[PDB]
Amino acid sequence: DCSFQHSPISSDFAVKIRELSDYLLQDYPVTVASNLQDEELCGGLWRLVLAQRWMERLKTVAGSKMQGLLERVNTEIHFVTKCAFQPPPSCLRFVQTNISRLLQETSEQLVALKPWITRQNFSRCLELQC
Amino acid sequence: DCSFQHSPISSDFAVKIRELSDYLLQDYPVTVASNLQDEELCGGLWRLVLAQRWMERLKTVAGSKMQGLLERVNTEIHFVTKCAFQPPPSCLRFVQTNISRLLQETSEQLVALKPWITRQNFSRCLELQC
Amino acid sequence: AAVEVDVSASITLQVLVDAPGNISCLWVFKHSSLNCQPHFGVVSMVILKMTETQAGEYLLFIQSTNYTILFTVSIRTLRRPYFRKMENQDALVCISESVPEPIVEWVLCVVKKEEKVLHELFGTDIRCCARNELGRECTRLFTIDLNQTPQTTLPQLFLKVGEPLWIRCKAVHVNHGFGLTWELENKALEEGNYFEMSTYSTNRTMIRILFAFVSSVARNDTGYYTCSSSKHPSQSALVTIVGFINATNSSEDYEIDQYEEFCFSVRFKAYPQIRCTWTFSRKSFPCEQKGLDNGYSISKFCNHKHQPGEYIFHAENDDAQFTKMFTLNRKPQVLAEASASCFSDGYPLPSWTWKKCSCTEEITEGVWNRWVSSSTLNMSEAIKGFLVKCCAYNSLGTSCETILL
Amino acid sequence: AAVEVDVSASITLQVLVDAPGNISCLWVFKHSSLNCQPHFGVVSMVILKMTETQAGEYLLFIQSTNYTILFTVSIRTLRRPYFRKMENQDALVCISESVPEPIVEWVLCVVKKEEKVLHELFGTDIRCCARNELGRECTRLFTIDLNQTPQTTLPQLFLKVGEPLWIRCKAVHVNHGFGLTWELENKALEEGNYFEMSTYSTNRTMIRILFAFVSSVARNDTGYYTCSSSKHPSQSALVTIVGFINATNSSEDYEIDQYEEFCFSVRFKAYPQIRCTWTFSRKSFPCEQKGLDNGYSISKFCNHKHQPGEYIFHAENDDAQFTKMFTLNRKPQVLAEASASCFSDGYPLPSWTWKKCSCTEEITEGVWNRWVSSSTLNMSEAIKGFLVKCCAYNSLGTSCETILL
């Protein structure tokens, strides 16, 4: 299953993203899923899981001080790991995009997800769909 | 012509590079000349000119705070523009490398150039050679 | 351009332009004309005792160029900060009133952020301050930290009917898995009287702010409020809807010897914060009107200077007044044993005992009227060549003087 | 067995053996015998203020068994920071000596960086401080800022032969296009007496540090040093090879009435920084030995307490001493106008004027020897039935007494 009783989405998450972006080289290449099935319940959650996977990869190649900014943005979206999300399906295609694009979308997904995170049952989001 | 009366190489330049590196995603793709002619007088100077050209490109896609760290490293090597270096020749091939590699080499070039910057006439370095 | 005139003041009003040459002026007063003769260039209009008549629109036209100047001559409150949640987002705003308009600074303890709008409302000691010509009045945001140790005194919150109630409930927990809830006098809480903010701390910690508010309070809203967390102990605070001063004005009496270390005290529950004054033998000194946090404020006075008498404590607020009389009170001293009689002063009543034999025998006799005591004995002696001694006794000590015959 | 005695300390020395019974001791002090009476078994020798005399070999022989014990009683600075350039890189090191070993902190003004090794030597006011049990002694790095305004006083740098000379020359320029150079007394400067560091500032600015140093100074190294920049004005400082205290010890006298606001002063040029003490009627108070920056330091004393007398200022450094004596100073009162003559006391000298007519006429005459003054006039009067009056006058006030004839 996958659901959250009390809200795991912070009010000041947009701050941690603007702070990370202030020390970032905006066209650093990251990826985003190109063919994620249209699902207005799991959609943002699937991308947050993916964006989350990116925050971890980035921390490993980040400098001492950049590691803190990444980790702090990682904390804002780390709750997605509280759920047993299945590994991406073979059908899922990824496309190279700027880290600024990924950060912007992550912010957007958190905003849209904020009013629903505690009201919905996200058990069917565990399997990413194309 | 190209020569420097008083030294344009700072003593604390290695500090500004370690500080930039502390907020960098180390595998960000930059380039380095792959076929620069072996010239122990112009060599480091040619690469500093190129590394310098990169600091400018980077500032344009850098966040508000990363812009300061880039600019501060840019200042350490901006003196190369005091000389009318010719645009790269058609023979010059560039190869993709990590920004951490570029920063490391830049530091090295400044070190090697430090004892000679004011003693040599660099007029013949203006034309980059392959 | 804006002039502030304090009472019937005598000041000069001059203006200079960087171009001294053969240039002429013309003064244009409040709906009336005026002639001028200046210096090279600086022009002036001086006034001795500026009456309410001699104030307003005063212009000064010049010609080399054809220039014109204008001045607004005006003549010479501080209501504590109030709070209002910005309807736009999850952030608080400080509404402080005052004449002159004040500096509104938010202080989160310490760190000062002069903004009038605070968005970083998380933890510490949050208090807004208003600072103008009069001074600085501050309103502290009432907080209940469930995460912190209890002040277990069932804190009392006082406020006048119509004022806005603000109670921030802060709780810090390891995981984000916890909630917060508000409950009035047994009753829960109105939907338009609650708001929840949340952020992360240190090693993936979570801080929650569940504040409760009343736009304009009434008797209906007075009662015992409590905040409970779904991983924390329920801490409470009672709200007393209300100017008054409550203290025992029994007028207390005291007495000490210039060897004892002592401070006068006064415990009082009073709203609004009272202006206090400790006066004695006309010489008045202000007080450190500190809080005892128990449910009252205790004012102290220590600079007694071993000086005896009446120490009066007068304390008053905008709609209430008060005063408490504190009496203060040695070895007897023979003030004077002049001739024949003998006088001594002491506290308490000094006892006068007489002896007269020149072996020291004693005779007793005399009238006494009094603290200073004057006791005498007629000196009509059949016998001579003796010494008499006057003795003043007090429980504390004794002293005596001798006379010759 | 080894005892460490710190100063004239008051401690007890006891030893216990696990066998309490009817056993006897005998103390064997430094080449002298001593009697004992212990507890059951634990024996002891206690001392109050252990003098250098009361230290050494102290034995204690016991008999039930026939045992013997022996104890060796032994007895228990703050030299200002010195500088040495790290041979490794372009960075300075603070070498401060002291017992106990001190805290060596570099302060660049303010910002404190306790490191003993400073690499960020650029600008501001750089001073190293040593702090131990004794206290805090500081050595400031002598700087010449060509970029800054001139102190145009040809600054004087004093130091004892053998000490290390350190003069940092800092210059700030827009472009990096500028140099710096050092010049001694007409002569240039030794190759192993100079070092150049450089970094960037604000809008592509450049700061240059060209410091000069002497490992161990001598008379040879004393002279006028100057620093000139290839875009800046040549500023200089003279080096005086030497401990000394220069001040006027004339022992000055003063006098004031308890209504005047005054502070005692002492201007002095002394090296190293002196330890000063203001003592009066045995009661000694230390001083705020502040600098006047003119070319001397001026120490002040204000807490006079309108108390009259000798205020002595004693100041001394490691190789020099000093002391300066400051003297400090009513209505006339007729002490006695007994018979015929009249005496009055006052400060300053009370003037005695006489009048004798019985309309009050006056006659003048008399001899006076004195502050108390005794002036008299023979009373041989041709005429009688008059009153004479003695008048003692002082600038402050006057008093008089009358006599009868």
From Swiss-Prot, chains A, B:
Keywords attached to this entry: Cell membrane, Cytokine, Disulfide bond, Glycoprotein, Membrane, Secreted, Signal, Transmembrane, Transmembrane helix
Cystine pairs: C2-C83, C42-C125, C91-C130
UniProt keyword Disulfide bond present: yes
Claim: Glycoprotein is one of the keywords in the record: yes
Glycan attachment sites: N98, N121
Extracellular domain ranges by topology: 1-130
Disease: Immunodeficiency 125: An autosomal recessive immunologic disorder characterized by failure to thrive and chronic diarrhea in infancy, and recurrent bacterial, viral, and fungal infections. Patients have severe human papilloma virus (HPV) infections with disseminated common warts, and the bone marrow is hypoplastic with low levels of CD34+ hematopoietic stem cells. Counts of B cells, monocytes, and dendritic cells are low in patients blood.
Summary of subunit composition and partner proteins: Homodimer (isoform 2).
Listed name of the protein: Fms-related tyrosine kinase 3 ligand
Gene designation: FLT3LG
Residues shown, of full length: 29 to 158 of 235
Swiss-Prot record, chains C, D:
PTM remark: N-glycosylated, contains complex N-glycans with sialic acid. Autophosphorylated on several tyrosine residues in response to FLT3LG binding. FLT3LG binding also increases phosphorylation of mutant kinases that are constitutively activated. Dephosphorylated by PTPRJ/DEP-1, PTPN1, PTPN6/SHP-1, and to a lesser degree by PTPN12. Dephosphorylation is important for export from the endoplasmic reticulum and location at the cell membrane.
Ig-like C2-type domain mapped to chain residues: 150-240
Sequence ranges on the Extracellular membrane side: 1-405
Sugar-modified residues: N22, N66, N203, N220, N246, N249, N378
Expression (tissue specificity): Detected in bone marrow, in hematopoietic stem cells, in myeloid progenitor cells and in granulocyte/macrophage progenitor cells (at protein level). Detected in bone marrow, liver, thymus, spleen and lymph node, and at low levels in kidney and pancreas. Highly expressed in T-cell leukemia.
Compartments (UniProt record): Membrane; Endoplasmic reticulum lumen
Superkingdom as given in the UniProt entry: Eukaryota
Cysteine pairs bridged by disulfides in the record: C25-C36, C129-C138, C169-C227, C263-C302, C276-C287
Disease entry from the Swiss-Prot or TrEMBL record: Leukemia, acute myelogenous: A subtype of acute leukemia, a cancer of the white blood cells. AML is a malignant disease of bone marrow characterized by maturational arrest of hematopoietic precursors at an early stage of development. Clonal expansion of myeloid blasts occurs in bone marrow, blood, and other tissue. Myelogenous leukemias develop from changes in cells that normally produce neutrophils, basophils, eosinophils and monocytes.
Family: Belongs to the protein kinase superfamily. Tyr protein kinase family. CSF-1/PDGF receptor subfamily.
Other noteworthy facts: Can be used as diagnostic tool to establish the exact cause of acute myeloid leukemia, and to determine the optimal therapy.
Function, as annotated: Tyrosine-protein kinase that acts as a cell-surface receptor for the cytokine FLT3LG and regulates differentiation, proliferation and survival of hematopoietic progenitor cells and of dendritic cells. Promotes phosphorylation of SHC1 and AKT1, and activation of the downstream effector MTOR. Promotes activation of RAS signaling and phosphorylation of downstream kinases, including MAPK1/ERK2 and/or MAPK3/ERK1. Promotes phosphorylation of FES, FER, PTPN6/SHP, PTPN11/SHP-2, PLCG1, and STAT5A and/or STAT5B. Activation of wild-type FLT3 causes only marginal activation of STAT5A or STAT5B.
Assembly notes: Monomer in the absence of bound FLT3LG. Homodimer in the presence of bound FLT3LG. Interacts with FIZ1 following ligand activation. Interacts with FES, FER, LYN, FGR, HCK, SRC and GRB2. Interacts with PTPRJ/DEP-1 and PTPN11/SHP2. Interacts with RNF115 and RNF126.
Listed name of the protein: Receptor-type tyrosine-protein kinase FLT3
Encoding gene, per UniProt annotation: FLT3
Segment of the intact protein contained: 79 to 529 of 993
